[PDB]
Amino acid sequence: RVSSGRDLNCVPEIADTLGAVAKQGFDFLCMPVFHPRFKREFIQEPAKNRPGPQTRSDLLLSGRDWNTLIVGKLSPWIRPDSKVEKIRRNSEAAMLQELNFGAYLGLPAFLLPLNQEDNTNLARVLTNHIHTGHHSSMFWMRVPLVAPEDLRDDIIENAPTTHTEEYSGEEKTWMWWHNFRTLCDYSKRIAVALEIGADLPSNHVIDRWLGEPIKAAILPTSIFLTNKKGFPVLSKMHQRLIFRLLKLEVQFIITGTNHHSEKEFCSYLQYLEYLSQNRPPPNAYELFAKGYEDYLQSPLQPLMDNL
């Protein structure tokens, strides 16, 4: 079947964007709930007294569409762990304003990015939001397999990429996730949205994500190769990981622009659906155990109790 979603940071008109995305075959849309560039001031005059609606109306979609088709995204300027106090304070207020608006809309999930080592204040703001009312909506933490600092081109002459194998260092993004969830005291509402890079890390790095609550896998269009016919495809190494992720039954997210411009955008999803269709079948045990995955039970006592 495979559950799929489209990631965008540009939604000029919400109605047609959703419509166009649905027409491509996608089950949901990851989009900003406030304009990603619309930086807001909460303390200083005259900018704090900016008028007009702060974002688009909830009336633009049906309650069911908000609840089932939209995954919210935190604004890229919201930096709760900034070393600048003024930025930190506006970002706390903005994070709450955005997370509260998502709650108002009844959004099923909301995306937050783990793009650096220190996300302590981001963790604090999110734990205070979790402990303010109900416990429905999911929080998808956007964390890459390989840190952006470790996948940059070796094009800076006076700052070369480290050619020393750092076993623990290649696993830095897991510790960013681990620290955050440890701080938020293992909240069941906090999961992983794992971002796949152009070059897959060493197997050990991939294996670290075993046992972790992966609810989404983010596939950029830029990681796709081009086959003879000019269609987007993946390396055999990338395919292997997709098959492992399909055993976890994750939701797949396609991010980025069309890099195969001569073809329709849906070709990226068509490929994904093909890998989903061409996966090994469930054996007698895998068929029987279906529905019992990580379901805890009391061990049976046929001596003390009559079965």
Added chain:
Amino acid sequence: ESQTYEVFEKDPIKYSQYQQAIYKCLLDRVPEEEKDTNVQVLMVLGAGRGPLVNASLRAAKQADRRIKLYAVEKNPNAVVTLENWQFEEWGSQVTVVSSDMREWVAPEKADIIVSELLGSFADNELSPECLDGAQHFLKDDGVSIPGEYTSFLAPISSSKLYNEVRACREKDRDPEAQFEMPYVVRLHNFHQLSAPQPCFTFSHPNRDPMIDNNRYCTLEFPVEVNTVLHGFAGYFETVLYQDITLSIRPETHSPGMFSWFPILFPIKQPITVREGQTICVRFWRCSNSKKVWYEWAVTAPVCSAIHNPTGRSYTIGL
């Protein structure tokens, strides 16, 4: 949430009643000679997503009178709905105010203040406190819609509901906390043991020097059957304007109005009642700096413990 406002808006009976009450009040404030010469300052206090703003506009057009609207809303999320409605449809006629009605510094005084801050037990959403704060910016001769509300109580027998309440015991809290708090519930499998009697009444505006929203009420319920008392069902009635009312009291229930289900005040221990005996209950509306709450006790045929003392199990945040 947006979905909670969407379900309030699904009740047409409520807003058609509000529109009618505003229309009737407009004709009593502006006579046909002053028709389009005098403009009435109307303030919707707790405007939500704006259905009351639209009701006030439909009323001014049907009455053929001039109105200047203010839409006061504390919820910033609902303010986004309001500010988008304002810009797209309402225009300069409607001024959207993102403020708590108690904190708001008004530019003008109001002729009419329109609000829907009522719970299933009328005052349990703290309509009195909210409207008392906002009272200062109403003109001396000013009208509040609603003008009055009254809560009602009746003793009930229901072993199913007693079992349901019991099942609300939670870890990390008093093992009997569940009995010291009201529940909004569509009462089905129950028995009313006596007729509903008025409990607490509030009137707006509150023209008295020492304004006190605290109350103590004693209710005597004649019982003509042998039975077991499991709690008290709560309802309300309100006067929007003159004969324009809204009621959830079963005997006078507004037809087709599903905006409020009844409330249930449980009792920790079931009380046996014999035919000819009177059930006597005492209810208190209490408050401090930061919270408001109810306390209750049964004194006849036997005593119960005072339920929710100091709001230890249930409070309404100010």
Added chain:
Amino acid sequence: ESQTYEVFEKDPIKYSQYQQAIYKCLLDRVPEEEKDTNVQVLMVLGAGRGPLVNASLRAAKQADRRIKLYAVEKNPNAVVTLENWQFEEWGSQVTVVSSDMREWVAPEKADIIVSELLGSFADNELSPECLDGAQHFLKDDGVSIPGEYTSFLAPISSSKLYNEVRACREKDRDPEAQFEMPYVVRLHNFHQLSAPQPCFTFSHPNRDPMIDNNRYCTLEFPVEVNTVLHGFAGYFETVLYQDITLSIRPETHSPGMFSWFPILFPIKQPITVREGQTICVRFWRCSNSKKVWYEWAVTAPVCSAIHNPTGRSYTIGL
């Protein structure tokens, strides 16, 4: 209670320091030429049973200056002690005010505001909020005594205290609530793992447009020994006036001053620390409409959970 005030008054070092600070400030506001020609408005905010009122009078007599005293006290019980002292000894020179310093409408503006609203972790009795409210009735050139305070923290090892905290598990509440709250304790059987570092600082008067008493502080504690982290000991330091200070920080501890014991911020799970490793802790001072609270977490060598999120286990009532 009366006995709590009686034990505060048993510390002479504290009031002799306050008297000295008032005396020194009086000489800096009134020069010898204006000696008995200019009368200084002095307001004791949170006057208690009046020892600060007597300290202000002893200071004005020793400085040979003229003062008009106001004794502001919210506690009505303490007001009885005050009003009896006023009538019997103080006279018209002292005006007893039964009010919250934040709510009080002052007849005159103050030259000096004297207060003792400090806890073991300085600001934990909400001295900042209280003095911010009262700030409006202080003259532009006005002095606040104390002018400044700073809280301090240091990591501690103590298996006895960890066991003591654990033993505070109570029925009807989160089974780990006891670890998410500070304790005033005369620390005996413990080990300080690193030197105290300043945590939060407040200054009075608060001359800034957007006044924010919220804080976030990161502290890095170099550890030169192998050990187990069980919590954090908290102390404070204050500047009453110029070089006149009061301190519970061990290295600078005011001699013979027993008015404050240290505070202890526990951690739910003990953290192993190796020699040469740094302990990194984060503390937050938070607040809403009605409450103020602390939140804390250890991020190095390993992470802890954020302790007391949203003040779920411990709050300070506004």
Added chain:
Amino acid sequence: PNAPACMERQLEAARYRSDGALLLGASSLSGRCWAGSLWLFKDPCAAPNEGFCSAGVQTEAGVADLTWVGERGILVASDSGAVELWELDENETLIVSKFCKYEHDDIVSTVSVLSSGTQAVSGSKDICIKVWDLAQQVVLSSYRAHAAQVTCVAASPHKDSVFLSCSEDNRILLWDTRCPKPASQIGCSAPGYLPTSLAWHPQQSEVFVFGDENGTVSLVDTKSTSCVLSSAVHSQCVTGLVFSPHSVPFLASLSEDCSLAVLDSSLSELFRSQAHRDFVRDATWSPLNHSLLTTVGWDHQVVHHVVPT
């Protein structure tokens, strides 16, 4: 006037061409529709009135940045991830789309035209820097040197293979397309506050100014004594830095604190304007009267300042 009926509230860019005509960029950063527009005002005093423009066009997404390309070209950094080229018609009454190439995987945040005027450099939130061939309508080079969002790209005034870039990864990079490893990290003495704006000196070939997230403006010489000279100009982040057309140039600095500052050669303040009620987004000096300076803000104000030279 053959253009959109209404121009979006959030003005992002203001740029004067040789003759004195004003180019404007706007986005709707709120409400139902999040789109943008491009406007030409031969009478800059009539701006932002839509009925008094020379030309006007609606773009599909928002305008994060724009730049003039000669005298009739308009290069646009779009929210869509596209770099757009627009061209004024023969009469200069219509703004027509030449190309719209969607090459970036996120919002195109910054754009600068190289010395030749036949090549352009784009920066994005997608962390890439792209070198474009404007005539061939293609990407010549794609560089992933940064580790975070690319805030600013500033092409060298006379060296066509040289440009500056700054990012949220705290790097200020000096580029020279001639080298095999084209980027070089210019060390701002230690870590510090993130760089938010860049401006090449119009006379001194190896000199540039840069603004940070904390409101400090710093003056850098590519080949000097390691450390520079600075001034705490703003209370909030320095959004932009623009040099005057004068022989001895003055520097205009604009911030999120809603103020404009005009500084001298040694970074000392000469002018300050608090005319804007919201964020100051762009600044452009009149080519005709060098004592004039136009600023645009999110408050929808086109303010013409009389700078005391």
